[PDB]
């Protein structure tokens, strides 16, 4: 993971001092899509979604199956994350699923929810799936981030805005990612 | 990982079919289907290097090879360590390799370890025998150090061969030589990949 030093060079964020407007809109592409639909997540944030829903509704063997299938089919080949579709289904109109879905705006606000609710259920460690990081670094930074106070400056922007949906009490659109440029600023002032 | 079809294909190692060979080099049949010296070539670059003290393996190689010791010798705690914080530090960095070097120095020269060790003259062949004596002991699954995949993807593939009849193409020759050193009953400095270039021509041919 980059140093914030290291990520302001990349991004050509010093003007020390930052670029704010730039900065702004490089955490702002962090933080992604919107949700609408795990259907339209990418494949390795449906079948972690149905993991977490089905941990949060007490399945731990829907939750541990898809979890063996990925790690056993990522040993000569990508993880089948298809075998994720009957939990999604099961679990996606679920009461607690929907509460959790109801406060956030984007994919990775709405799946960092839902694993820090399935940790409710039992400890969901990232080293129940360390394919995440060669597949999807942002994704992997982010739910690794869940339960820290600091994140790393790659997923600063989204973690954020999660933490702002949560001071606000509901889901937003617009993007709240100001404490990351505050957080970026101060780490670059040495 | 590649099909023998996909491999064969990779390294340029099908010949035409209906082959009638002028000079087929020893070892390879007049009417062989693949091409055996390119073929010997391949499966011995898979061997990778002998085994001359595990403080010149690669620090994977070396943080699993101390796991499997720590199995073998009954102490789960060392081994469960190891593992628990080669995942964690692989969060945001390389695995820590270097917690395994009080593993390593407890059990490098322990009664069941050497006895393994002698039997085996390659890095590949020495480790792939030090996991299956820790199955001895538990199971020891390679979904306990998923890290290794994007690491070291050779060492991933020899690993998850071991217990196994049939190997991946990409360490078919490292498999065929702990298989010849078991058969032999030692170790073998010189390559013993030819079951390796056999398997390759009989998939070849029930293709076709």
């Known amino acids: 993971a980059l140093t914030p030093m290291e990520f302001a060079r990349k991004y050509n964020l010093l003007r ?20 609408d639909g795990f259907e339209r997540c990418s494949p390795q944030a449906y079948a972690l979604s149905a993991v977490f829903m089905a941990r949060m509704n007490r399945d731990r063997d829907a939750a541990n199956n898809i979890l063996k299938v990925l790690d056993k089919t990522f040993v000569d080949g990508k993880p089948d994350f298809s075998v ?17 879905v109801a406060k956030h705006a ?10 820090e609710a399935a940790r409710e259920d039992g400890v969901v460690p990232s080293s129940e799936f360390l394919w995440l ?10 739910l690794n981030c869940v ?18 949906e ?25």
């Open 84 to 100: 994720a579709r009957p939990v999604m289904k099961k679990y996606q109109n679920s009461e607690l699923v929907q509460e959790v």
């Open 16 to 35: 020390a001092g930052i670029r704010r407007g730039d900065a702004k809109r490089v955490f702002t592409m962090q933080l992604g899509p919107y949700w």
């Open 106 to 115: 984007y994919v990775l606000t709405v799946i960092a929810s839902l694993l």
């Open 133 to 142: 990081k060669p597949v999807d670094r942002r994704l992997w930074y982010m």
């Open 147 to 164: 339960g820290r106070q600091t994140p790393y400056s790659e997923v600063a922007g989204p973690f954020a805005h999660w933490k702002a």
């Open 166 to 190: 949560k001071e606000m009490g509901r889901r937003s659109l617009v993007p709240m990612i100001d404490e990351a440029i505050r957080a970026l600023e101060i780490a670059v002032k040495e």
